[PDB]
Amino acid sequence: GKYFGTDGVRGVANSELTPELAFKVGRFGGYVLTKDKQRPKVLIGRDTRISGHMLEGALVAGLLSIGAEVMRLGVISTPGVSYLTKAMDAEAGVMISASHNPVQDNGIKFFGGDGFKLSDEQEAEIERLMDEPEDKLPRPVGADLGLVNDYFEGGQKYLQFLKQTADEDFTGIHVALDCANGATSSLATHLFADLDADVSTMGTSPNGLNINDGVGSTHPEALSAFVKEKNADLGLAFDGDGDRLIAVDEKGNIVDGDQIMYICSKHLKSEGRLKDDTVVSTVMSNLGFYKALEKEGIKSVQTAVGDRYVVEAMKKDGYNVGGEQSGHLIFLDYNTTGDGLLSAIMLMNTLKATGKPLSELAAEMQKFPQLLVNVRVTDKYKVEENEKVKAVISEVEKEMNGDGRILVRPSGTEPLVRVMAEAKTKELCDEYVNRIVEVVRSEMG
Amino acid sequence: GKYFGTDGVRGVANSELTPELAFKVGRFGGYVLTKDKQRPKVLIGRDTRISGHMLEGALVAGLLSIGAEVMRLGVISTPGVSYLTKAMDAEAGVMISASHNPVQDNGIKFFGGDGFKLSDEQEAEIERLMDEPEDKLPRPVGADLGLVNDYFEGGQKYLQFLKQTADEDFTGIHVALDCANGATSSLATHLFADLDADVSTMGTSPNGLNINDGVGSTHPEALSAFVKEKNADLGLAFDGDGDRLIAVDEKGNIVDGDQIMYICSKHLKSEGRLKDDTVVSTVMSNLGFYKALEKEGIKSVQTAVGDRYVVEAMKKDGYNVGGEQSGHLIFLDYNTTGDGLLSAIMLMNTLKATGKPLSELAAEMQKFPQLLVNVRVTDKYKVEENEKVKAVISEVEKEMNGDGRILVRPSGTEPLVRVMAEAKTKELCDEYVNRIVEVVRSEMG
């Protein structure tokens, strides 16, 4: 009915995301991808979550009961699953994980031959079957049955590829890594050490219970302190599945996905590699990202939140680069989903080639301050129109005239409305927001 | 209701023995064995059957959804599973296989802590649960979930143990091996080669479709020809799971489980190791086995067909050795189920120590000829009594007076009765059987 959301199937493993269901998934989904040849070739990959194994076995059982030849990969980032499912011309690819969420949660994700999430048509049918109450799909027996050749060497192919996209070894750089105790634990540390960089690690020590546990892109303050401690040049914080990246500069400060997009797209434009010198990004990006983009003559396209949209955009118009503030950047020259380590290597290429420190590079793009004030109200949904509100906003919008931005939306969870303001400084934020907030409390209370 | 038969659960994999059911098994059975500690320790092992993997994954999924720490072993004979489940003090042990059957079939088998099939009480409850239609067993989540550490090194521990029970290396012996393309493929050939024996192989080349395919204990004629071809001293034919053994002498002839029991128990008695110098065996054994046993002053106990009974017997009365004509011999000094390779090493110990060739040793025990004649009849079940039949038999029984044996039983499959006769020679068989057969056709036709 509705198993496949944004990020595939998710639940708390065993309770909601039962192995029964991870069976039905691989069984039916392997049927759907079976329409080509009698013997599809799914490959499957997972992070360090303890539920990993339980799901991987039930999923592979499903796949094998409908003839699919199956290639376990072991622990590997979602990037590497997509890269390999393309490079090995495999009918599909699967990733058991639930990036950056806590360990108890997990999820199944699918990739097609091309390295892209499955067509909404396909997922459609997978769900069609998963609600019939008769498993009338074929049951091959004897020699028709699925086959299963492990391929734990997959990892070092996706390593072998990342290693070629580094414009020279990184000698002379001290990098700290925090790998969320996840799929990137063993991949990253081999990579940057095989690229001749002084690596200092942390969060690289998974036990299947510690993924994303005060480490990783979502919790970068540990890494913030570790950089200063080990006095490194920068810190990289991947998340659970190796699909995001948040950096940290020698000064200890955080370097979100807008600043990484800025930094990298700018370097890329200096090699002629930025395609039509444009960059896709989402609403969520910070006004000062668009400002410093103009300043470097890089144009931009905005899309709605979520990388199905940011990738929908780069596809048609053939764009080279696109990203989110989350740290989720796509370099389509190289791979078809967000790739933490790719991001990180592009960032290091920048650093090496410019001899600047990460603080300097990220200072070109100046973030605008934000401000949120939430006011409790009687009837939060009647703010869509108002004889005052609706007006106030518009005036302040024009008063700002490109140097600012306002956003007022009612909450779901509660009975209050959220006023929010980008401005060039903290005191303009304060002025503007207070204005709107006043004409709201006039109505409600 | 009735899933656990003699040899565990069996079916044709996927069609009857579905992965769904191999899930319910490990889930419920891991509950039943969970009553001790919150974190049982099942270990699991399989043969080369292609359905192996599919079942192993669904089974491990079950086990993990109820907290069991689980130890994959890979491919290993059922012997080695039992040996290890004892030596590692593990709550249970599991073997996915269906020995000597064709590849399409498979099966789940259970062993307790002690190395013995599970108590009929336990299997009882496993089935109790498997027919409730509500999976109300706990669903641990987060850190309670199952854990899974592979242990593919298990194999070479059970090797390390077999290698100690060989009374000296086997230098100077040429042995041919036929391992049914099964679990014993890699174990045997390392073993006898690490014991310094000239090994010539066959059936050692599994691809998950060729198990028991004109090789192995059930189909020994290939091996019969191979021994003569490679002019070896003897041939060993294990079956799919490494639980049986049939030998073949340098002359090419077959050496069934009665002759191996004779040969080995006799050697053992010569080391004082045969306990109370007795040997357990089943009805199925050949009169001349009992004769040559008397001749060497070894006493004997008979039990009904099947090793649950042959082991029930050695348990109470503390017997050292017991076997079946199948090749399924138990040496309880050393292990708790039938052990093909153990048998084989005991046989080689005999050979080495006596310097005799296998033909000579197996000639001490002289088999009596058998004869079967099946007569079609009108009402095959009224032969339990007869005014002629019942008499004829009894007379011929006493006429034989210990030198013979008769057995007449009606068939199920068809409408006819089966007359059968052991005698000292082929022409006594012919006489005796013809007598009975005559007084049967008198009635029926």
Author numbering:
A (entry chain A), B (entry chain A): 2 to 446
What does the study report here?
GlmM is a phosphoglucomutase enzyme catalyzing the conversion of glucosamine-6-phosphate to glucosamine-1-phosphate, which is subsequently used to produce the essential peptidoglycan precursor UDP-N-acetyl-glucosamine. CdaA (also referred to as DacA in some bacteria) is a membrane-bound cyclase with three predicted N-terminal transmembrane helices and a cytoplasmic catalytic DAC domain. c-di-AMP is formed from two molecules of ATP by enzymes containing a DAC domain. As part of the current study, we investigated how the activity the B. subtilis c-di-AMP cyclase CdaA is regulated by GlmM, a phosphoglucomutase enzyme required for the synthesis of an essential peptidoglycan precursor.
The B. subtilis GlmM protein displayed a four-domain architecture typical for phosphoglucosamine mutase proteins. While one GlmM molecule was present in the asymmetric unit, the typical “M-shaped” GlmM dimer arrangement was observed in the crystal cell packing. Interactions were formed between domains 1, leading to the formation of a large groove at the top of the dimer molecule, mostly formed by domain 2 and the active site of each monomer subunit facing the opposite direction. Two different structures were solved for the B. subtilis GlmM protein at 2.9 and 3.0 Å resolutions with a superposition r.m.s.d. score of 0.29. In the second structure, a phosphate molecule (PO4) was bound to Arg419, located within a loop region in domain 4 at a similar location as observed in the B. anthracis GlmM structure.
